[PDB]
Amino acid sequence: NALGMIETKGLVGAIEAADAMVKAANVQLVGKEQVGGGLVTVMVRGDVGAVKAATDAGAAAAERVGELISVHVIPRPHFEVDAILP
Amino acid sequence: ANALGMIETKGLVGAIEAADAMVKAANVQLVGKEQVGGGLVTVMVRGDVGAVKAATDAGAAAAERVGELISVHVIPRPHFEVDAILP
Amino acid sequence: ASANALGMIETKGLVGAIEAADAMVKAANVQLVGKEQVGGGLVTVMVRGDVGAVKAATDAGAAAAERVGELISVHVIPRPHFEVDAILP
Amino acid sequence: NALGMIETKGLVGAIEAADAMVKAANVQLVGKEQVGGGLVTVMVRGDVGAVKAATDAGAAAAERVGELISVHVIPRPHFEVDAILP
Amino acid sequence: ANALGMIETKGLVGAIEAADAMVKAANVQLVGKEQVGGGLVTVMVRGDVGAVKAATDAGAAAAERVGELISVHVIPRPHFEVDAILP
Amino acid sequence: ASANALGMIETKGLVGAIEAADAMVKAANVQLVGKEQVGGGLVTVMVRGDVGAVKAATDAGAAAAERVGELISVHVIPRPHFEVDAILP
């Protein structure tokens, strides 16, 4: 139940990232969050290997259409963290 | 009619002009606009792949004329889970 | 078929937008249909009417915004499609 | 029925402006608007002379505690403009 | 107990530390916080003039320690119409 | 009397905040009480608990935020007044 996250400056890069992630591997899109300042984060859940593959694909995609700001995976997130996810 | 075209501008005027140019350039459907702060506005259309490419190219040119274009992209066949984060 | 003409003025700041709006409705027989704000301090005011009225209004509004130092964008769409009409204030 | 407007970057300057305006002359506070980007506008209504006096006082005050961005008076605003005021 | 003290910071942490320092420095009442975008957060207290001056000075020092202070001001006797635009 | 200790981490970006939050709750017995966003991309995550637990959590969270490049502010208030408690998530 790993968590993968990609943050972009702009919604277009985030949607491209999200689409590339769920196409690339056996992950599920948890949703998107807009925190202001133009930053948009999209997130997926799945096995750690699938989430690594998905986030690599998403980050490559975001970078080509937009502004990749960050990409990270948390392999075993703590249950409380779900409270602040989309 | 599943392809998705997206145009993002800094400013609303650019996005409205983009949306109007899109729907006039080809038979595509305007599905909404989203604002994410810092002035960034995105407008999106759906349609068949060819129409969406033509529309998004036209929209991008229109946004460049009146405003500030930030991003332009077409996804020919979005994953079904992606529909759930669209406006 | 097309929807009524649309004139739009975008300013950095609300004061410029209100000055623009006031000048627009004073200059011509147009309807002020609202304002929208998209962050970063950008505010857009919009009018609808006949094409000539909207052109005259928007030119007056742009001048007023530029006078007080706020003008980012100005544009008229003489014959907007209804699809777009549907995403306006 | 003149309209006076002061825009500041920050709420503190706007509240100081508003307080100084209504203290300075026979004007009424219409309200405040926050348009994003940190910009806050406060507005008053009254006779043109009162609104000129009020806005001068408010602008002087905003400048001392904060960031005055703009100050302007519209002497005879058109009725449609009320639709987009606070 | 009508005086108004206001502290504005870029960032929420600075504002929370300011608010805590204010209410600990003197007998003043925290009346709320407001966010106006671009990261700017304002916290406000009410109290008697002396207390509010002391509290706001303490709050400002606390905000400077942990964050970014933007503005600090005390209005001893706000106009009654000003209450209507406060949080 | 005072309310439970409070630890806060502010980051530029949500990814840094989630990394911080995860590290905080992993490092100590604290309650994650929420996140707040105030524009400009700034996100704050907060935990409550006993003072020592909150100190340990917040130190772990700050490290994690700094590792991924996002850290703006970090602070613990060991004994917050309830008035403040009242304006938190």
Residue numbers in the entry:
A (entry chain C), D (entry chain C): 5 to 90
B (entry chain A), E (entry chain A): 4 to 90
C (entry chain B), F (entry chain B): 2 to 90
Give the published text.
To understand the structure and function of the C. difficile eut bacterial microcompartment we have determined the crystal structures of two proteins with homology to BMC shell proteins, CD1908 and CD1918, and show that they are well conserved between species. We have also determined the atomic structure of CD1925, a member of the EutQ family of cupin barrels. The sequestration of ethanolamine metabolism within a BMC is thought to protect the cell from the acetaldehyde produced as an intermediate in its breakdown and to prevent the loss of this volatile compound and its carbon from the cell.
The structure of CD1918 was determined by molecular replacement to 1.62 Å. Three protein chains were present in the asymmetric unit, with each chain visible in electron density to residue ninety of the polymer. CD1918 displays the canonical BMC fold with a four-stranded anti-parallel β-sheet flanked by α-helices, and forms a hexamer with molecules related by a crystallographic 2-fold axis. The oligomer of CD1918 has much flatter faces than CD1908 and it has an open pore at its centre. The faces of CD1918 are primarily negatively charged, with positive patches around the sides of the hexamer and a positively charged pore. This pore is 9 Å in diameter and its boundary is demarcated by a loop between β-strands 1 and 2, with the amide nitrogen of Gly41 and the side-chain of Lys41 forming the boundary of the pore. Electron density consistent with a sulphate molecule, a component of the crystallisation condition, was built within the pore, and there are a series of water molecules above and below the pore. The presence of a sulphate ion within this pore, and its narrow width, suggest that small polar, or charged, molecules would be the most probable candidate ligands for transport through the BMC shell by this protein. This protein may be a channel for water, or a conduit for the transport of the ethanolamine substrate, or for the exit of the acetyl-phosphate produced by the phosphotransacetylase encoded by CD1920.
